[PDB]
Amino acid sequence: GFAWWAGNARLINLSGKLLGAHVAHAGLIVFWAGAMTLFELAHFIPEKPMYEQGLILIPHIATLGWGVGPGGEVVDTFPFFVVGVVHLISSAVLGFGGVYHAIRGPETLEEYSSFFGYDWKDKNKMTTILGFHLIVLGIGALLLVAKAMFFGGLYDTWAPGGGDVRVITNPTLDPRVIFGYLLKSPFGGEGWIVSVNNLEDVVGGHIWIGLICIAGGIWHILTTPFGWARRAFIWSGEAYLSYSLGALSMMGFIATCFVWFNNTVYPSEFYGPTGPEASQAQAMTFLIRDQKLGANVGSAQGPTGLGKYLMRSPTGEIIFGGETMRFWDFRGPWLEPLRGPNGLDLNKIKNDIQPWQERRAAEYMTHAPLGSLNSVGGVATEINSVNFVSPRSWLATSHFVLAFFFLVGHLWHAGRARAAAAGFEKGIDRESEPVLSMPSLD
Amino acid sequence: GGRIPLWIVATVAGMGVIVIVGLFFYGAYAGLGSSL
Amino acid sequence: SYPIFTVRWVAVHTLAVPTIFFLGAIAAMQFIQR
Amino acid sequence: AELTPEVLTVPLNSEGKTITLTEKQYLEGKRLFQYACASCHVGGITKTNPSLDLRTETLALATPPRDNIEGLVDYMKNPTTYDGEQEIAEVHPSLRSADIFPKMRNLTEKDLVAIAGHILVEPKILGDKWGGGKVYY
Amino acid sequence: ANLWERFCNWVTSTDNRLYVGWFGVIMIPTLLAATICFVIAFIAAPPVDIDGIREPVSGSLLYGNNIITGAVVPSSNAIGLHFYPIWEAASLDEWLYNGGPYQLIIFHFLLGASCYMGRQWELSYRLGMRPWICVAYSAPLASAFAVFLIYPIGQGSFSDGMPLGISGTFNFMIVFQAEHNILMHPFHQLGVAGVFGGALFCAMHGSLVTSSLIRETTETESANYGYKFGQEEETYNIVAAHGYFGRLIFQYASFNNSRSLHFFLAAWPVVGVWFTALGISTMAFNLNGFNFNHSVIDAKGNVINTWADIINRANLGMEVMHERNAHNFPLDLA
Amino acid sequence: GTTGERPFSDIITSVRYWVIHSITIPALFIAGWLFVSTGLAYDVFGTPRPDSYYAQEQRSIPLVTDRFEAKQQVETFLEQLK
Amino acid sequence: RGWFDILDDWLKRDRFVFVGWSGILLFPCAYLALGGWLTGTTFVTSWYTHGLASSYLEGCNFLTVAVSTPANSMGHSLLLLWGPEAQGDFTRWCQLGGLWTFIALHGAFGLIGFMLRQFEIARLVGVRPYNAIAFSAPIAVFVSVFLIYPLGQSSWFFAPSFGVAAIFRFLLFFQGFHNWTLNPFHMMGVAGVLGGALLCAIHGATVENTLFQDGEGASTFRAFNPTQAEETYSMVTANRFWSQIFGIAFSNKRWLHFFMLFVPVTGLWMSAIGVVGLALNLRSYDFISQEIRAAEDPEFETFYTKNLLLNEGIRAWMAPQDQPHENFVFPEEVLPRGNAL
Numbered sequence A: 001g002f003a004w005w006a007g008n009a010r011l012i013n014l015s016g017k018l019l020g021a022h023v024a025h026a027g028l029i030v031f032w033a034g035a036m037t038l039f040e041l042a043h044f045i046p047e048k049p050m051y052e053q054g055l056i057l058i059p060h061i062a063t064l065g066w067g068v069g070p071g072g073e074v075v076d077t078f079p080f081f082v083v084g085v086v087h088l089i090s091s092a093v094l095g096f097g098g099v100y101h102a103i104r105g106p107e108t109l110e111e112y113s114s115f116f117g118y119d120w121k122d123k124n125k126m127t128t129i130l131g132f133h134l135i136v137l138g139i140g141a142l143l144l145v146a147k148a149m150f151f152g153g154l155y156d157t158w159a160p161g162g163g164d165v166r167v168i169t170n171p172t173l174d175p176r177v178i179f180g181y182l183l184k185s186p187f188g189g190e191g192w193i194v195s196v197n198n199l200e201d202v203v204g205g206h207i208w209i210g211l212i213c214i215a216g217g218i219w220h221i222l223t224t225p226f227g228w229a230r231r232a233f234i235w236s237g238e239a240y241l242s243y244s245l246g247a248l249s250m251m252g253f254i255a256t257c258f259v260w261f262n263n264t265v266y267p268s269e270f271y272g273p274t275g276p277e278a279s280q281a282q283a284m285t286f287l288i289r290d291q292k293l294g295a296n297v298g299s300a301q302g303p304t305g306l307g308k309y310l311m312r313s314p315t316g317e318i319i320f321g322g323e324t325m326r327f328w329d330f331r332g333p334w335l336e337p338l339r340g341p342n343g344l345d346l347n348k349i350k351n352d353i354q355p356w357q358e359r360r361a362a363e364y365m366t367h368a369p370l371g372s373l374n375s376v377g378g379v380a381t382e383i384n385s386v387n388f389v390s391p392r393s394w395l396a397t398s399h400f401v402l403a404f405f406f407l408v409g410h411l412w413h414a415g416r417a418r419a420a421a422a423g424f425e426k427g428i429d430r431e432s433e434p435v436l437s438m439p440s441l442d
Numbered sequence B: 001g002g003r004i005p006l007w008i009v010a011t012v013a014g015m016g017v018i019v020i021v022g023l024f025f026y027g028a029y030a031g032l033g034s035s036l
Numbered sequence C: 001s002y003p004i005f006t007v008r009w010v011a012v013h014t015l016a017v018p019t020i021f022f023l024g025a026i027a028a029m030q031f032i033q034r
Numbered sequence D: 001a002e003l004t005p006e007v008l009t010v011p012l013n014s015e016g017k018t019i020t021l022t023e024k025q026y027l028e029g030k031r032l033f034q035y036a037c038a039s040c041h042v043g044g045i046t047k048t049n050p051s052l053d054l055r056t057e058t059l060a061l062a063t064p065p066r067d068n069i070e071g072l073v074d075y076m077k078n079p080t081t082y083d084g085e086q087e088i089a090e091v092h093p094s095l096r097s098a099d100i101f102p103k104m105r106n107l108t109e110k111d112l113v114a115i116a117g118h119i120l121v122e123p124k125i126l127g128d129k130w131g132g133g134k135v136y137y
Numbered sequence E: 001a002n003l004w005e006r007f008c009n010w011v012t013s014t015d016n017r018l019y020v021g022w023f024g025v026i027m028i029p030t031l032l033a034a035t036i037c038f039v040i041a042f043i044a045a046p047p048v049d050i051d052g053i054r055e056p057v058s059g060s061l062l063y064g065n066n067i068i069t070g071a072v073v074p075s076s077n078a079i080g081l082h083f084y085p086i087w088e089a090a091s092l093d094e095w096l097y098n099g100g101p102y103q104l105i106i107f108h109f110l111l112g113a114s115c116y117m118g119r120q121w122e123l124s125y126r127l128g129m130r131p132w133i134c135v136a137y138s139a140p141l142a143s144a145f146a147v148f149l150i151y152p153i154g155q156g157s158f159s160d161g162m163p164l165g166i167s168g169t170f171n172f173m174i175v176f177q178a179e180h181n182i183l184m185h186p187f188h189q190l191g192v193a194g195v196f197g198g199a200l201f202c203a204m205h206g207s208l209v210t211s212s213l214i215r216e217t218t219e220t221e222s223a224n225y226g227y228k229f230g231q232e233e234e235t236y237n238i239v240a241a242h243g244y245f246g247r248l249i250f251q252y253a254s255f256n257n258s259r260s261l262h263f264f265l266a267a268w269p270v271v272g273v274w275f276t277a278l279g280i281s282t283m284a285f286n287l288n289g290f291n292f293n294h295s296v297i298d299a300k301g302n303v304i305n306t307w308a309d310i311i312n313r314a315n316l317g318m319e320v321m322h323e324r325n326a327h328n329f330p331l332d333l334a
Numbered sequence F: 001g002t003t004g005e006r007p008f009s010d011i012i013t014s015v016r017y018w019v020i021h022s023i024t025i026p027a028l029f030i031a032g033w034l035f036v037s038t039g040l041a042y043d044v045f046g047t048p049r050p051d052s053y054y055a056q057e058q059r060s061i062p063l064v065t066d067r068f069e070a071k072q073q074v075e076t077f078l079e080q081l082k
Numbered sequence G: 001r002g003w004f005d006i007l008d009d010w011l012k013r014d015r016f017v018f019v020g021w022s023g024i025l026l027f028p029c030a031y032l033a034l035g036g037w038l039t040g041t042t043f044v045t046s047w048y049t050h051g052l053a054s055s056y057l058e059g060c061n062f063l064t065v066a067v068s069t070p071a072n073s074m075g076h077s078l079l080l081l082w083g084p085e086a087q088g089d090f091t092r093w094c095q096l097g098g099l100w101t102f103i104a105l106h107g108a109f110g111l112i113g114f115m116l117r118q119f120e121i122a123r124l125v126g127v128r129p130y131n132a133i134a135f136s137a138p139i140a141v142f143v144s145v146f147l148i149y150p151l152g153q154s155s156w157f158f159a160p161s162f163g164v165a166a167i168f169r170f171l172l173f174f175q176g177f178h179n180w181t182l183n184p185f186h187m188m189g190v191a192g193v194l195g196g197a198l199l200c201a202i203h204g205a206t207v208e209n210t211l212f213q214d215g216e217g218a219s220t221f222r223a224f225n226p227t228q229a230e231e232t233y234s235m236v237t238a239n240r241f242w243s244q245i246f247g248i249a250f251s252n253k254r255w256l257h258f259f260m261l262f263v264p265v266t267g268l269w270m271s272a273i274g275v276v277g278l279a280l281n282l283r284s285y286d287f288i289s290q291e292i293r294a295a296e297d298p299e300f301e302t303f304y305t306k307n308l309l310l311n312e313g314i315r316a317w318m319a320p321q322d323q324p325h326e327n328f329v330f331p332e333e334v335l336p337r338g339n340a341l
């Protein structure tokens, strides 16, 4: 009894048609990933930084070690091509299967086969489908391990000499590190799982999650929900969808912070500098310039009485001054050579800054992730000229929006699934209004 | 009375706007008003 | 049996006719170079 | 007002010879300056060293004088400090340093003339705005 | 008859004058903490080095503020996004100087408010209602998250979250316009449309229902006494109201289905305020309003100003002056 | 529910409707187009062309500064272009 | 049954667009105001009055086009096409800003027409005239902002110009010069607009989630009949809910819907009064106690003093370009500026 605008709710109990819808929808996702990569490649110019070019897919591929060499220089675009083509081709197959099951295929599965057919209230069947996909997901995570250890490695922004592609031979297995991250605070200087800053920990966590997902898939194939879970949840398709909505929302919020703060699995070489990074780089830039003119940056008092170039953090570390004091938790490969045990080392600042570090600071400062909707780069008072919005702003903003609506989608479908399950989603029964049988409040 | 199906009139009005509006966005990057 | 020309008829064309004229004017404008 | 050959006539060197660009060259120059230079020099300032702008009066007091096509073309090959006392190709884009500034790899000699031409024209059009900063936006 | 089952039964009781519920078990303490700390800080808190530059701003009534100027001031820029609970300070003296109460108040409040939204789902379930009033409240909730949490996360500091005070609010707006050109952002424009239209349709609907009240009273009594709580008969004539509105505009621009009308009322401001919360939340990552600065130039290349450039002149005056002692380098990157 | 005018759904799906309007709608669009492309719109309304905001060596607004001589003032500026 | 009653008959016939006697005033004025604005933003410059481009023809987009106000030199001239300024020359009329007064005045009489239309239709249909009454708030706002405010000032030049960005500039002007956010009459306007939007959303949501089950389908919209006598949602359950969530709830549907009229209408009336004061520069600019202390005590800083520095920046940085008739020349050294920026 749904209206056209709620028309896909007509599929709830048509498993063969609902299968075609998912598989056709999976084809669109594969299609876009293929089309968009090729579109990016056709536009790519290798002499420009990726992040002056509106690229978000090519950086995800470079980061896996394909096509790049030392310092993120693109050496070979053919891998990019291959990824686009293969996705694009594969979408026709998913497309084919989706429209077949959606139009011609059996409308319902449970008569054609007892294996593929399902009933949402069959808690056992449901947890078996769950277990199958968990095993898939665990295999997925191990592919990333396989790449990193056996098939060429991964791009490492922290490698010596500019960063470079590196095979990971000692992935971190120590659970105290791996789950250590999951118990770090999400606040500044800690940053929960977003602070992961080396490929050993990245690959080791994927070994773990791969094992955990396979273990859990086998667990869920072999078992049925215990009574306490039986009585805690709503067991319906719309309830299950609302659970996944909640989870995707949470993941979207996390990915937003990952791309905004993390410069390890989003190398700044490809994505542009982070906000903190660019801000730190501005202080570095003027520290350098002023010191070449003879300024003693260690002993320069700023207008506030705090140091103009260098000051202390609240726990004592020597950090960049000005408003960037907020960003002193920033860590990046162009800066760390200057850190000593107490923070920035004044003797290395006076003696050991290298031209490449001058270059990289000047470059990141002039590529801060600020820009207008119409891609005028920089603060909102800048004149037109520079056509630039960071990949990072594009990826962070889009995913905050998506993550938000999915939380709204979670609330919508969770509340409805509860009400439908108890039988009052279509409204209040006039002849049995619960408030009219309750005593008055006063 | 009903000789033209309404959905077709709707589809073709539809692209009619998409074209005029897309021209107007193209024009934001060409010529007057493009900053160039 | 309906009438063609009505008050409604006039209200509509009093808006629709200048609209298309302005749209053509505004379309031409996109090809003006400085 | 319009983009006349008077405004498109800029000095070629210090000897006083001059050269008239075309509107094609100017727009080519503006495009290439945007591609290669505006990230630091938008509107004729220098975001990473505001004390040195691209005003013609400033280029003229540079050593080698830089207020002419030749001086600008040489600067893009072998940039020096304002007193000319040191070469700075390792921290400033140039053809000498196109290994480390990859946007300079595909610039031809004629691209340089246009970039240089745009820099010398633009203050004739904008006035104080070129190199003046936000005060003049 | 078990002790826990009896507790569960009071928690979830529909007879409590105010509904507690499981979300209420978190909401009650967190909002109490935030309320009590707010009231005391607003009255007596000493000045706070909001911008980390050892330049304390006085926010409370006893330090020379009035109701309009007072505020609980954001925590120091020197803290950035670090967690600063009381037990992380050497003393309350230090916590107060560095803005500790702002953090205490907003974290408890965002929690309690989030639980406020859950509580609306929960009671709706206990009373046999449909469930989506909480979805309407997610619009203001999202907006508070944006100015108290999201925007500081993207800018790297709670010192740039919104102050808890009337004038502090205006300071946040002016600084925001200078750095994000928020007026020229479509998501703010939609928020204005959701909020102007919200007020519009509030007045419209209130006037249309009020216009078609059925005569039930004399002129010496409030017409309001023509309605008795819980009467089954509607108290106005929707066909008369549609007959007026459809003629004021034209027939098909008027609702005669009360359900579609009231759903319209819910949707328009909710959706507009989602967008404007999303606008704040996306300008938190510096994807700013449209920039048409110097977009029109003449045949020679002279700049021809538009109203957008004038806006920019205003924006620059806001830029150059804000936090006038806090910037040592020429770009305010965050 | 109806006031006697012919329903729109019935008109815009009618063949006679589209017979007339497949001429009138393009005719109007072309006319609008030509108002601009011929330059007539500039002249009717007084709008400067890209070449005529300023005289060549000039960056002063020709701002109207008198109330009753304002008409003559604008013409004084327009003649400072010819 | 002479001509006048025959004409009344025709004006009041039930047709797709009711005309009425009010239509004679409303329809020409509304249409000319609408047409003047579309004409001006498509084709007409603001070069001679403001030194701005402002039409599609000139390279502007939907956000930057405007029908701008006349030059400050026009004072409050009515700028009649046949008046002494334009002297019947259409082209000069356009270049001097005549289209602005054209739109303002015709809009004003169109607004009158519309409110008379609400009166007329309500008398014919037999309902009470509360929608007309509510519309007094938009009228008050419009005359106070577009007519009274510039009439207290030096010229129409300082009225709002009809344009998206031009109105944005009007907002910022009022902050920098009038400190309008500090004005309790505006604050009451804010609480009325935001209070209305809240009432709007909370009332629609409530009804939609206390619906009675009156049909069998998942679309609850089909289960309403406009001639049914029964209320379509439970006021009793709605009241319980809000009583237990918020502590208090509406219990009287008549009060509730009158309250929805009251809140936004009152809020707008209040902001209009504030704007009448600003006509005279009667601002809520300062708190004297705050300034006495701050001048004497240079460690004393509030959000109040911080916002006035911002106002001072706005004034100095926008005045020369926004008020070109004043020929303000502010050398670099006099512009107020924090460190570095």
Ligand code: CLA
Pocket (backbone or CB within 6 Å): A003, A004, A005, A006, A007, A008, A009, A010, A011, A014, A017, A018, A020, A021, A022, A024, A025, A092, A095, A096, A099, A102, A103
């Ligand atoms: C990803 C988007 C998506 C997907 C996959 C689906 C899928 C589906 N919908 Mg939903 N729907 C959607 C969006 C989507 N919908 C939207 C946006 C709306 C709002 C308008 C609706 C409204 C809606 C309604 C109202 C109903 C559905 C129904 C259905 C199902 C039956 C379709 C049918 O009988 O069509 C028949 C249509 C055709 C035969 C026309 C041609 C369609 C084909 C598939 C186009 C494919 C084109 C492609 C280029 C071909 C390449 C093939 C190549 C690879 C070989 C189907 C599984 C129906 C349902 O639930 O049935 C119980 C139903 O009643 N949908």
Ligand code: CLA
Pocket (backbone or CB within 6 Å): A019, A023, A090, A093, A094, A096, A097, A098, A100, A101, A105, A106, A109, A112, A113, A116
């Ligand atoms: C997850 C998605 C999904 C699911 C659950 C189903 C499920 C089903 N399909 Mg559909 N189908 C799918 C995708 C899917 N299919 C795709 C992608 C296509 C296009 C190729 C089709 C085309 C299709 C047709 C043409 C027909 C079905 C039919 C059926 C039924 C029986 C199939 C059978 O006996 O398997 C046989 C088992 C095998 C062939 C197992 C061998 C291993 C598989 C095929 C390879 C797996 C590789 C890997 C996991 C994925 C690809 C790698 C890639 C990442 C590069 C069953 C209900 C039939 C039906 O309903 O008849 C009435 C039928 O006629 N399907």
Ligand code: CLA
Pocket (backbone or CB within 6 Å): A127, A130, A134, A182, A183, A212, A213, A215, A216, A217, A219, A220, A223, A224, A225, A226, A229
């Ligand atoms: C897609 C993933 C997925 C999904 C949907 C499920 C779903 C389910 N699992 Mg399975 N499970 C999975 C993966 C998954 N599982 C994996 C990978 C494993 C292997 C480790 C298991 C191991 C497992 C066991 C051992 C059991 C289940 C059980 C269940 C059922 C009850 C779950 C429950 O009450 O959670 C609700 C969870 C809680 C009430 C506890 C929350 C504890 C977390 C860590 C608190 C932290 C919250 C914090 C805000 C989030 C940040 C994380 C933090 C650590 C940093 C349900 C069907 C139960 C069942 O009935 O099985 C038959 C059961 O006993 N699962």
Ligand code: CLA
Pocket (backbone or CB within 6 Å): A004, A005, A006, A007, A008, A009, A241, A405, A406, A407, A408, A409, A410, A412, A413, A416
């Ligand atoms: C995994 C994602 C997912 C899935 C599978 C569903 C599935 C479903 N939803 Mg939920 N939903 C989701 C996410 C999801 N939802 C999110 C994120 C939200 C919050 C936004 C909602 C909010 C929501 C509501 C409010 C309702 C549903 C309903 C439903 C059912 C019918 C929906 C339908 O027919 O759509 C039909 C599709 C349309 C009408 C098309 C909508 C078009 C969108 C709004 C425009 C977006 C344009 C985009 C930004 C790009 C702009 C570019 C331009 C060129 C177009 C179906 C069970 C209905 C329900 O309860 O039924 C049980 C219902 O009333 N959904």
Ligand code: CLA
Pocket (backbone or CB within 6 Å): G024, G025, G028, G029, G032, G078, G079, G080, G081, G082, G098, G101, G102, G103, G105, G106, G109
């Ligand atoms: C009801 C419709 C209506 C209303 C109220 C207005 C109102 C107005 N118009 Mg608009 N106008 C209208 C329709 C309307 N107009 C139409 C239909 C057109 C298109 C043709 C225009 C075109 C238009 C232009 C082009 C201009 C106006 C202007 C004005 C303003 C000045 C009018 C004035 O001075 O009148 C003076 C005249 C009267 C008040 C008429 C009074 C008649 C009395 C009662 C009888 C007098 C007897 C007579 C003189 C005897 C004749 C003698 C003979 C035998 C020798 C005013 C706001 C001006 C404006 O906006 O300023 C910028 C302007 O320039 N109007």
Ligand code: HEC
Pocket (backbone or CB within 6 Å): A362, A363, A366, D033, D036, D037, D038, D039, D040, D041, D046, D048, D049, D052, D053, D054, D055, D058, D059, D062, D066, D075, D076, D080, D081, D082, D088, D092, D093, D115
């Ligand atoms: C695109 C190829 C260009 C061109 C044509 C120029 N630059 Fe730069 N520039 C930068 C810095 C920090 C300085 C000061 C150098 C110093 O003296 O230490 C300069 C200087 C110049 C000049 C000289 C100006 C003068 O008044 O003498 C010129 C003519 C010049 N540049 C031209 C910084 C940058 C960049 C930062 C990454 C980038 C990119 C460019 N410049 C690019 C270009």
Ligand SMILES: CC1=C(/C=C/C(C)=C/C=C/C(C)=C/C=C/C=C(C)/C=C/C=C(C)/C=C/C2=C(C)CCCC2(C)C)C(C)(C)CCC1
Pocket (backbone or CB within 6 Å): A021, A024, A025, A027, A028, A031, A085, A088, A089, A091, A092, A094, A095, A096, A098, A099, A102
């Ligand atoms: C059911 C349904 C639906 C859905 C649908 C879908 C969603 C579908 C999908 C499907 C798909 C998803 C599709 C895909 C396709 C694809 C294709 C068909 C492919 C092709 C390819 C090609 C051909 C390629 C080629 C190439 C190469 C190889 C190289 C490079 C170049 C090129 C590119 C050329 C709808 C809603 C509509 C409606 C209702 C029903």
Ligand SMILES: CC1=C(/C=C/C(C)=C/C=C/C(C)=C/C=C/C=C(C)/C=C/C=C(C)/C=C/C2=C(C)CCCC2(C)C)C(C)(C)CCC1
Pocket (backbone or CB within 6 Å): A177, A178, A179, A181, A182, A193, A196, A201, A202, A203, A204, A205, A206, A208, A209, A232
């Ligand atoms: C990969 C990687 C890694 C790792 C990771 C990991 C290992 C993960 C983990 C994760 C996990 C481990 C997670 C978990 C989560 C959980 C959750 C999320 C839960 C939740 C729950 C809930 C949701 C509940 C609810 C409820 C309640 C509370 C009551 C009753 C009812 C219910 C059930 C509803 C690292 C970082 C090292 C590095 C990089 C990469």
Ligand SMILES: CC1=C(/C=C/C(C)=C/C=C/C(C)=C/C=C/C=C(C)/C=C/C=C(C)/C=C/C2=C(C)CCCC2(C)C)C(C)(C)CCC1
Pocket (backbone or CB within 6 Å): B017, B021, C014, C015, C018, C019, C020, C022, C023, G031, G032, G034, G035, G036, G037, G038, G039
């Ligand atoms: C002033 C004047 C006058 C008058 C005039 C007029 C009356 C005018 C008219 C005019 C007009 C009457 C105009 C029109 C135009 C229109 C237009 C220009 C339109 C636009 C459109 C659009 C662009 C849209 C689009 C869209 C979108 C975007 C989305 C949705 C869909 C649509 C389609 C809606 C006279 C002569 C008396 C004299 C005096 C002066």
Ligand code: OEY
Pocket (backbone or CB within 6 Å): A323, E051, E077, E155, E159, E160, E175, E179, E322, E323, E326, E332, E333, E334
């Ligand atoms: O706008 Mn301007 O940018 Ca965001 O930081 Mn840099 O200055 Mn300061 O502390 Mn509050 O405020």
Ligand SMILES: [Cl-]
Pocket (backbone or CB within 6 Å): E171, E175, E321, E322, E323, E324, G306
């Ligand atoms: Cl400030």
Ligand SMILES: [Cl-]
Pocket (backbone or CB within 6 Å): A321, A322, A323, A324, E326, E327, E328, E329
């Ligand atoms: Cl700084």
Ligand SMILES: [Fe+2]
Pocket (backbone or CB within 6 Å): E205, E209, E262, G203, G257
């Ligand atoms: Fe109502």
